[PDB]
């Protein structure tokens, strides 16, 4: 046999995050009709993990690459969960405007997501390089910021 899953969950993570950013943010609608508010919360929830998978990724930037590859999996596989409910409630916007605003903010945080992996794989082949840790930090950082952002628009901004 030989090493399982270092390589193979910081390639997945892409796989995902640019599967669904693709095909949600574009071609791709969720025709989920129903209470706006379910959407909204079922985006919240999946946002809190999400938070959480960024973290990982940055406890794990300043322990193994081994570690980087379960965050690299889960922040993944869990982005999809956050868009799919995202763009979900996205496609409830009534108004246009808003609905192309709220999914240039999914964009954003779907774009962050992945410059963030990019950032753990590259770590995963340089581990012994101190300033990536703190580009990864940062740029999770970003991501965390993103979700927050979107997160805090989906609520009635005040």
Known sequence: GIDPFTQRDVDNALRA??????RLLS??????TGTFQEAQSRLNEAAAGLNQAATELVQASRGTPQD????SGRFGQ???TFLEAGVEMAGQAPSQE???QVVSNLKGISMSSSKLLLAAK??????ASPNLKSQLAAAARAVTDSINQLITMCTQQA
Do not use: H, I, M, Y
């Open 27 to 32: 071609d791709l609608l969720p025709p989920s």
């Open 17 to 22: 995050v640019g599967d669904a950013s693709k």
């Open 98 to 100: 808003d609905r192309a």
């Open 78 to 80: 869990d982005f999809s």
């Open 68 to 71: 980087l590859a379960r965050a």
């Open 122 to 127: 590259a770590l995963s082949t340089d581990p």
